[PDB]
Amino acid sequence: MAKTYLLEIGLEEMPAHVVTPSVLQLKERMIKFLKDARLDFEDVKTFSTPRRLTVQVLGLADKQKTAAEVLTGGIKDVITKMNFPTMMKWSTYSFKYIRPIRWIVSLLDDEVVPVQILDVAAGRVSRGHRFLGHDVEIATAADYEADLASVQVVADAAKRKATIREQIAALANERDWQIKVNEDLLEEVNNLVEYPTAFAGDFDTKYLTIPDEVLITSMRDHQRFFYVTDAEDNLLPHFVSVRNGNTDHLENVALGNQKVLTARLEDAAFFYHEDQQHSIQEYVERLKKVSFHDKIGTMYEKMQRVMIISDFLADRFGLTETEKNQLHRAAQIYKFDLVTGMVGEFPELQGVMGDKYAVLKGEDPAVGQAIREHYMPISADGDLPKSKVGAVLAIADKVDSITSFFAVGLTPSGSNDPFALRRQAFGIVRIVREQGWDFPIRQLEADIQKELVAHDATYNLDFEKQTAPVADFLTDRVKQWFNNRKIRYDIVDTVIKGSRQDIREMFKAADVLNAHQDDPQFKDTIEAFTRLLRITAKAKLAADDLTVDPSLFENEAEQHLYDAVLELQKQFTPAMSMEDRFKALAALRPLIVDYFEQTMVMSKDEKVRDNHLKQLLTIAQMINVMGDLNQLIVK
Amino acid sequence: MAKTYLLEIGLEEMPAHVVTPSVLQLKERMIKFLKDARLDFEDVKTFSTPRRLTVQVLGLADKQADVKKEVRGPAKKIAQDADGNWTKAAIGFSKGQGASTDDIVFKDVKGTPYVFVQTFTAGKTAAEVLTGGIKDVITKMNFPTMMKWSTYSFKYIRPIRWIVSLLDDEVVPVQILDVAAGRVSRGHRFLGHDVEIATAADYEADLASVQVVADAAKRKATIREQIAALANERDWQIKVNEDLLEEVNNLVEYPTAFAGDFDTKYLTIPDEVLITSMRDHQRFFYVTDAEDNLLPHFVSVRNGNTDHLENVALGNQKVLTARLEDAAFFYHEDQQHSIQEYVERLKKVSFHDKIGTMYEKMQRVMIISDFLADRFGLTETEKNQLHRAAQIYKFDLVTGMVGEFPELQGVMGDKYAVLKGEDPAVGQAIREHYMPISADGDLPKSKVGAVLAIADKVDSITSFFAVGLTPSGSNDPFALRRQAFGIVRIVREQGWDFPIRQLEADIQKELVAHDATYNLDFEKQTAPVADFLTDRVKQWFNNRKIRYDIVDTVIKGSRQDIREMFKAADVLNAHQDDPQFKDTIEAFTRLLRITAKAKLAADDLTVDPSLFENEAEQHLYDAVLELQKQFTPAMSMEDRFKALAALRPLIVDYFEQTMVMSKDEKVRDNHLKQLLTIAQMINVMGDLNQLIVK
Amino acid sequence: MSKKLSVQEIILTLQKFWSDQGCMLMQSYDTEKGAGTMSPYTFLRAIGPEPWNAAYVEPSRRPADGRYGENPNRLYQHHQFQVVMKPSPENVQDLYLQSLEKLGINPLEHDIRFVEDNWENPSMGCAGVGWEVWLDGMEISQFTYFQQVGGLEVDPVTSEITYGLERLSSYIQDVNSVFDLEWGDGVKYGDIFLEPEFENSKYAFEDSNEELLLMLFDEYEKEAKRQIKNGLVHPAYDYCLKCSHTFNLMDARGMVSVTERAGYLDRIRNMAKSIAKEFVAQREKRGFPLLKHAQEETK
Amino acid sequence: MSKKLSVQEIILTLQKFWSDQGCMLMQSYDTEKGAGTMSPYTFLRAIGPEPWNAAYVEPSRRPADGRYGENPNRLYQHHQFQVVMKPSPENVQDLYLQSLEKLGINPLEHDIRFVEDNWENPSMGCAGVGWEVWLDGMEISQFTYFQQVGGLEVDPVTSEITYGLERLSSYIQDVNSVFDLEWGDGVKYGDIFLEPEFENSKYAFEDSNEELLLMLFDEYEKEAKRQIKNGLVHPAYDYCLKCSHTFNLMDARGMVSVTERAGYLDRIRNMAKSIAKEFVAQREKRGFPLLKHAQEETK
């Protein structure tokens, strides 16, 4: 029979940002159980409140053995074998769980399916809302949600979140406010209450003197309030949250929350008007005490190193005089705001406050934009700098960080990345893709060491011996980026195992090869190139005299392939798009195949064999721009 | 009318040792007020409770003594004419005194009749003088302890809670800083309550209602009566101390005597320890039997009724049994260690910084005691036992019994040494070297203990003056005056030749011989001891009624021997009547006064007979020679006195014939030699110039 | 209007209610600390299999929180109320709600959040999982199941509730400053603690003796290790508390970089782990008296 | 038959009564001392003209009184109850009687005596006059008017009542050992503090480091003097309390001769006297808030 079974675990209150996936895992386990226990069903609905996870199996067939005993055996393990970021030791037991287990509801339409865990057996009695509600019996598996609605709990997470959203729209439309809701913020809120009632509070207009970033940080990040703006996007002195109650004494709770937020806001105003006191040179000099790390040294000398790096990057990258001067100034002062109490209370707001303070002191706003952006990206899916100066600044910052932190041997591990250096490298790669620059990660060792010897040699013993492994760490991050975009492993191992080790070359070659891989004329080309590289790898020539002599040629395919190679080198240049490069190289595949058909390179005359190997190694060197194409498997 | 006043200051609870003297001082202050405020009354009864001090003045004459002045004027012949009328002068003298001629009375003065005008200049009534005297009486009192209230720093025995000031039924209103005086008294803190008083006589009666016995005599009578009732009811022989009764009497307001028992196992410990614990610390009356053997029972008094008596008894039993278990542990652990352990540990206990440790004190006292047995004439066994005791006499100080009961020092040393297979006489000597316990107290019954105590206290005083720790007139931090007093008492009770003149040399001498670590300025610092000890002997003599002049005569002897002074003083306080004695005293006073102003070298007194002018010089010289042929430190005092004095006819014939103040230097020097030899011989008994002849 | 509870009354009501739940009313441990978790009635008593139900007030001196007496929520010393129950009863949240009800707080009239905070104290090796109880947007409590105290697996599990007396009182008494608090018999918290705030602030910031602090820490560590060596747990733990407060004083003085901070915490971690080891060893040396007598009390 | 009152209930009853008598429920100061006199709520608060009404329990650690858990009334650590009222009310003995009656003790069924004892603490320069209150021959209280605290004349007069909680609990529970004392909810005092008593005894007698105590005291005194120089009253007072406890441990170790005992007392006495100087100077430098509040409370 297509009966309906009901399983609710009632717990202590759980962290919001993980409540939903846990019940999703439970759905998964229940479904997997039913497949593994060879059961049929129509649906599995889930219910989540901060105190309970519930599954409802609709249309459950009644035999695999009968349903009751299969559930008895399986449900205990279903509950136990669920997985969490954290698990906890309860009263006398080493049994670890996300939160200790308080009650269990296991009902087969009207039947009590006993499945017993610790001190709490399984019964048909559920607990209602923790403040407004009481415990309640459960009659039928279908009635569950309705019955909970009596005890003033919204079990359906989707319906509860919708309810909060509807109240949000009601408040936005009643006071002509523009409430802007965040989705992880709403996710937290939805999984923090069981019977919601949205509310709004006000705060004093004098605090509107301050930048919106501090206010939104306070509200959203700490009090989890939704800042109120107008149509013109001006920030209004109001905030919104949701109470875990009804509309009883809503005014008093709102007043208490206003009091708390106003405490935080007064702290912020004090920090603002206290940080305003000092001039920029004072912060710069005080930065000498701030060590960037134990074994590295201070943040001020780090800023000097980044300043030199930024000057070189402006030179190499081609920026106008104004851009170069602004970049130099920013690299001079971009990290000063790190020594402030404003960031001491708001760790999230670091960097941006430097932009606001320096711009406030009558400086150039582009410098402030770079200061705001040298933290960007803020996450793995975060935003990238909108200005050249900020991108260059962040790249230089992370370059210094990774070089030094590998000079200290702190290479991040599989689960431990103490300094987000993996994220820093990932951000560098993402920015490079967005901007497209020629980037030798091959010779940066010599560049960094060389230039520190030139200017400041205190940071100079084993600092490029540890910078060679960094090039492969950046490479691993690029490979993981490609595997995030599903690219074939052989394309990966080809663009990765390149001699150039240039980021833009890797990206462009991978894009071109992901495009042309569906053409019929592709496989033959690949075979020819692979064959060529296989023959060229063991040549005993100095790769500086590869001049090909047409007089040592036996047939004409050698002569004209040599002419084609020459005219390709006369066109193949460093200022060429990847698609043109590949098309031109591939176009010669009939030439290479008829070359090998006609010209046998395994020659009983040494000098001619050397000449032919030169003619082949020139193309091999041109190929190695794209990488090690022998690492493409075509089938 | 003769009135009755009632003044009780009710306080917080007072220490017993000041309750009676405080009420006696209140009597004295009231009396000083009454006399200076010229008041007469019949009686003043006193009442004291641990919470109040009360005087009750019966028969108070309602006025300060009015000035009934009697002023004399002109004679009757001048005040009255022949016609008997008043002369105008008898009118003027009466008018000036503020009276008339009617108030004139004729009173005879050496056979002449003078007028007298008794001007009754009235004095003062009770209320106002009471106000003034209450203030001044309150201000002055002095106490061992001190007091302080909120904003009214003032030193007192105890904080003042209520004041009752009643004149037969009339209220004397007077407020002290914030506390008024009213007719309300407070009963027992537990059984009673406040109560008003109608009349000053009723006071005692009303306290009886709220069950407080203000009469100290009645309280003690009832307490002792109930103690005797229990003694005759349980066949006990309670031995009560009187000072304990003083404490208990001045600690309670409504008594109920009671007895508790304790475990017979505690009879394993010394009876001295049991009596000390109970009596001195828990203030219990130990119970003896008919044969006077100590019973494992105790008696105390509750400041309460006979309700739930056994519960209080059990509380006292708990406290006593706790102390007794502590005592049993201390006893049975002190027995475990050997004597050498205590002896060696005594090295750490410094007797003082500049003196040293108590172990070194035992060494010095050991040498001193051996030397004292030598000089005093003690037997071989007595000397050996004394040496052993001085070896070990201070060990008991590092026992747990002395750590818990400091009083039981010496006694425990005897107990343990007797237990440790030592000589019981040695332990008794250890017990006795602490004696005497006060100025009025027991002395050692044994020669060994007497010598030990003398040597110990001698070392103590010699060292404490060797370090400059001289006490002042009212301050004696080390009770050294009591040690010297005991020295005198023991020497008198034993009667030994003890000259403080040469003890300096003896002590230094023998320390040089044995242990010179105590040998630098220790006879220069015993010279002021030769200047000491005299005042203590003088203080005892003035305690024994002896004429100050007899004291100052026997004291100023050259020998400075204590027993020599004792016997000479006995002789001279015995002769208050001999006829040829007064003449001797007069002659000797003249001779000594004349010799005091001789400026010759007192080491060169050889007398040259060729410088003689008459023959009485020769006869006196012959008498002096044949007396010196006997005169030695080897004669009883009366022998010296009689031998010197009997030749007073020779002395008088010398002074009559030979004029001593000679204008020839060598002749006067010869006279001064012949006289200063006699002065030196006399000064053995001392300075007879301190005799008043009557 | 109804009366807000004085600090006095808050302490009395909490103590009486938890006594109604069989907790023991210990007194604050006599050593300078930064939280009541480090008192032996919480720390040492929560390890081993011996049951322990206590509740006690504790002054917590946090030098880094000294504000010279102007900031009215950050203080050199604030006071916590510690509830520590072992083994944890399943009604611990119910009893916590009942306690808030006894404090004059109607749950029907207010919004309360259990926002998970995996509590950690690295110096003593204390680890715990639980919530920060937020009241009307204001954090008022720390409610935690302990999991690893002094590096040791905790059996039985100990529940802890930390009431923040300063913020709790400021909310309940509806004052905008912690120094405006009716402490007891109408006397303001400022009237007492205004001088300690300024004086200790200057002590921790601009007046402490640096080389003195260094020698004090080193000698305390030497002595605590020596005392553990013989097996004197509590005096060595006291010296460990002295080391922790010494580190707090130096770190607030401005002497400890991030480098040497970790080393100090490692040394304190080793000290606390060894102390816990020896304490459990000695309680096993005593047959666990608390187990015997508490089981005897249940019947 | 009736249930005897546990330490929990005894302390609660005393605290309730004194709260009803206008006392404030302060906490025991978090430092090792030897009596409740040395908490600033007793010591520092008794000088100056500012009124003060407090009541708190206080652990008294007297190293010389530790007995390794054999003697069940004299311990290394006992609990005192300090009541401190300034100025002393003239009905103070009435309040003391009401409190003892609140403990369920009828004076009609028991004997209570006030035996004069000249209270003195020379190291702290504290002088006081009052009684040792004996119940059925056993001293259960120390009731004292202060006269000279820290060498200074006391204005107004301060009353203090010190209850010996261990002896009182043993009496009311009618037990002959403190290790059978019911602390709270039936849990035995022995099962809790038997290990601390033995451990502290062995530390104070046979394991503490002598030179450590010497150097620690001397450095503590140097630091207290430094704080006095700048005027940091409470930190210097804490260092003085630690100095005194170190001195107590030295005397229990067998390190202080009778000679230098007086010298150490002189140094500690000057420490306390200078602290009193700085404290009164600063409090009169701040206009005396408690006088303002007394004016407010009278009106």
mmCIF file of C-alpha atoms in Angstrom, chain B residues 18-159:
data_model
loop_
_atom_site.group_PDB
_atom_site.id
_atom_site.type_symbol
_atom_site.label_atom_id
_atom_site.label_comp_id
_atom_site.label_asym_id
_atom_site.label_seq_id
_atom_site.Cartn_x
_atom_site.Cartn_y
_atom_site.Cartn_z
ATOM 1 C CA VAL B 18 37.132 45.412 85.259
ATOM 2 C CA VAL B 19 33.457 45.167 86.252
ATOM 3 C CA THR B 20 34.072 45.442 89.999
ATOM 4 C CA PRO B 21 36.830 48.120 89.855
ATOM 5 C CA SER B 22 34.660 50.114 87.439
ATOM 6 C CA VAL B 23 31.717 50.231 89.850
ATOM 7 C CA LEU B 24 34.110 51.012 92.711
ATOM 8 C CA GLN B 25 35.523 53.920 90.694
ATOM 9 C CA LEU B 26 31.952 55.026 90.017
ATOM 10 C CA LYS B 27 31.441 55.088 93.787
ATOM 11 C CA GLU B 28 34.652 57.106 94.240
ATOM 12 C CA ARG B 29 33.702 59.617 91.529
ATOM 13 C CA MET B 30 30.218 60.001 93.002
ATOM 14 C CA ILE B 31 31.732 60.506 96.473
ATOM 15 C CA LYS B 32 34.209 63.080 95.148
ATOM 16 C CA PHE B 33 31.272 64.879 93.537
ATOM 17 C CA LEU B 34 29.136 64.690 96.687
ATOM 18 C CA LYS B 35 31.855 66.085 98.947
ATOM 19 C CA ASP B 36 32.959 68.775 96.496
ATOM 20 C CA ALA B 37 29.279 69.471 95.836
ATOM 21 C CA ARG B 38 28.971 69.410 99.642
ATOM 22 C CA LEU B 39 26.312 66.717 99.721
ATOM 23 C CA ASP B 40 25.322 64.450 102.590
ATOM 24 C CA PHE B 41 23.419 61.188 102.271
ATOM 25 C CA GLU B 42 22.867 57.992 104.195
ATOM 26 C CA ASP B 43 24.272 55.198 102.050
ATOM 27 C CA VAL B 44 25.332 54.143 98.563
ATOM 28 C CA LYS B 45 24.641 50.561 97.566
ATOM 29 C CA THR B 46 26.322 49.234 94.448
ATOM 30 C CA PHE B 47 25.013 46.977 91.718
ATOM 31 C CA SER B 48 26.977 45.502 88.838
ATOM 32 C CA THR B 49 25.917 43.305 85.944
ATOM 33 C CA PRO B 50 28.017 42.401 82.885
ATOM 34 C CA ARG B 51 25.884 44.969 81.056
ATOM 35 C CA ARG B 52 25.388 47.780 83.579
ATOM 36 C CA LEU B 53 27.017 49.758 86.377
ATOM 37 C CA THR B 54 24.655 51.086 89.032
ATOM 38 C CA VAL B 55 24.811 53.195 92.161
ATOM 39 C CA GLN B 56 21.853 53.702 94.498
ATOM 40 C CA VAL B 57 22.108 56.703 96.832
ATOM 41 C CA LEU B 58 19.814 56.309 99.847
ATOM 42 C CA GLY B 59 19.027 59.290 102.052
ATOM 43 C CA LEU B 60 20.498 62.034 99.852
ATOM 44 C CA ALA B 61 20.245 65.368 101.645
ATOM 45 C CA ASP B 62 18.300 67.592 99.269
ATOM 46 C CA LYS B 63 20.893 70.380 99.201
ATOM 47 C CA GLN B 64 24.528 71.178 98.729
ATOM 48 C CA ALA B 65 25.850 72.428 102.062
ATOM 49 C CA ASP B 66 24.528 75.973 102.402
ATOM 50 C CA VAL B 67 27.129 78.523 103.468
ATOM 51 C CA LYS B 68 26.017 79.336 107.012
ATOM 52 C CA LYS B 69 28.711 81.948 107.546
ATOM 53 C CA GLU B 70 29.367 83.258 111.051
ATOM 54 C CA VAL B 71 31.013 86.692 110.981
ATOM 55 C CA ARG B 72 32.153 88.445 114.169
ATOM 56 C CA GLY B 73 31.668 92.144 114.802
ATOM 57 C CA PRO B 74 32.140 94.645 117.625
ATOM 58 C CA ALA B 75 32.067 93.712 121.296
ATOM 59 C CA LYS B 76 28.922 93.918 123.417
ATOM 60 C CA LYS B 77 30.100 97.042 125.254
ATOM 61 C CA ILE B 78 30.624 98.762 121.893
ATOM 62 C CA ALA B 79 27.606 97.271 120.088
ATOM 63 C CA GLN B 80 25.244 98.170 122.955
ATOM 64 C CA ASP B 81 25.119 101.269 125.148
ATOM 65 C CA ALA B 82 24.229 101.404 128.851
ATOM 66 C CA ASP B 83 20.504 101.531 127.982
ATOM 67 C CA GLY B 84 20.913 98.124 126.298
ATOM 68 C CA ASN B 85 19.929 99.553 122.909
ATOM 69 C CA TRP B 86 21.871 98.746 119.766
ATOM 70 C CA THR B 87 24.560 101.280 119.031
ATOM 71 C CA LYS B 88 24.563 102.371 115.408
ATOM 72 C CA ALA B 89 27.674 100.207 114.911
ATOM 73 C CA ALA B 90 25.650 97.138 115.855
ATOM 74 C CA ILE B 91 23.315 98.406 113.125
ATOM 75 C CA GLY B 92 26.042 98.964 110.535
ATOM 76 C CA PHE B 93 27.800 95.619 110.943
ATOM 77 C CA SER B 94 24.427 93.880 110.612
ATOM 78 C CA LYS B 95 23.409 96.068 107.658
ATOM 79 C CA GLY B 96 26.623 95.286 105.785
ATOM 80 C CA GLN B 97 26.190 91.534 106.257
ATOM 81 C CA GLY B 98 22.715 91.948 104.739
ATOM 82 C CA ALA B 99 20.904 91.365 108.044
ATOM 83 C CA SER B 100 19.296 93.364 110.857
ATOM 84 C CA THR B 101 20.064 93.696 114.559
ATOM 85 C CA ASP B 102 17.652 90.832 115.317
ATOM 86 C CA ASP B 103 20.041 88.254 113.821
ATOM 87 C CA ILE B 104 22.793 89.255 116.291
ATOM 88 C CA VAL B 105 23.913 86.600 118.783
ATOM 89 C CA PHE B 106 26.404 87.314 121.567
ATOM 90 C CA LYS B 107 29.073 84.618 121.830
ATOM 91 C CA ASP B 108 31.955 84.749 124.284
ATOM 92 C CA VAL B 109 35.534 85.070 123.003
ATOM 93 C CA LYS B 110 38.331 85.004 125.617
ATOM 94 C CA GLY B 111 36.203 86.824 128.172
ATOM 95 C CA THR B 112 34.706 89.426 125.823
ATOM 96 C CA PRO B 113 31.172 89.257 124.354
ATOM 97 C CA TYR B 114 31.207 89.794 120.591
ATOM 98 C CA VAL B 115 28.260 90.027 118.230
ATOM 99 C CA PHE B 116 27.915 87.343 115.573
ATOM 100 C CA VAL B 117 25.684 87.607 112.510
ATOM 101 C CA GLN B 118 25.043 84.155 111.042
ATOM 102 C CA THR B 119 24.405 85.012 107.401
ATOM 103 C CA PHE B 120 22.654 81.993 105.870
ATOM 104 C CA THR B 121 23.998 82.267 102.328
ATOM 105 C CA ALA B 122 22.061 79.324 100.904
ATOM 106 C CA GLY B 123 23.802 76.809 98.670
ATOM 107 C CA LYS B 124 22.392 74.545 95.960
ATOM 108 C CA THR B 125 19.633 71.993 95.396
ATOM 109 C CA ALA B 126 20.018 68.454 94.099
ATOM 110 C CA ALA B 127 18.990 68.662 90.426
ATOM 111 C CA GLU B 128 21.580 71.104 89.064
ATOM 112 C CA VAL B 129 24.542 69.730 91.020
ATOM 113 C CA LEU B 130 23.505 66.268 89.831
ATOM 114 C CA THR B 131 23.668 67.470 86.223
ATOM 115 C CA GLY B 132 27.168 68.888 86.664
ATOM 116 C CA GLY B 133 28.491 65.933 88.606
ATOM 117 C CA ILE B 134 27.118 63.359 86.192
ATOM 118 C CA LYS B 135 28.968 65.090 83.357
ATOM 119 C CA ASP B 136 32.299 65.362 85.179
ATOM 120 C CA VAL B 137 32.059 61.855 86.670
ATOM 121 C CA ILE B 138 31.520 60.382 83.205
ATOM 122 C CA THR B 139 34.432 62.223 81.580
ATOM 123 C CA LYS B 140 37.352 60.998 83.713
ATOM 124 C CA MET B 141 37.293 57.154 84.026
ATOM 125 C CA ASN B 142 40.359 55.112 83.020
ATOM 126 C CA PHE B 143 40.483 51.495 81.891
ATOM 127 C CA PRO B 144 42.889 48.847 80.571
ATOM 128 C CA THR B 145 40.974 48.968 77.252
ATOM 129 C CA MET B 146 39.727 51.706 74.921
ATOM 130 C CA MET B 147 36.524 52.642 73.049
ATOM 131 C CA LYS B 148 35.378 54.517 69.939
ATOM 132 C CA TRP B 149 31.939 55.375 68.562
ATOM 133 C CA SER B 150 30.927 56.881 65.231
ATOM 134 C CA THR B 151 31.873 60.574 65.400
ATOM 135 C CA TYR B 152 32.620 60.636 69.141
ATOM 136 C CA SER B 153 36.131 59.228 69.634
ATOM 137 C CA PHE B 154 36.428 58.593 73.373
ATOM 138 C CA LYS B 155 38.226 55.809 75.253
ATOM 139 C CA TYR B 156 36.041 53.701 77.530
ATOM 140 C CA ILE B 157 35.571 50.156 78.756
ATOM 141 C CA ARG B 158 32.381 49.424 76.747
ATOM 142 C CA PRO B 159 29.840 51.241 74.541
#
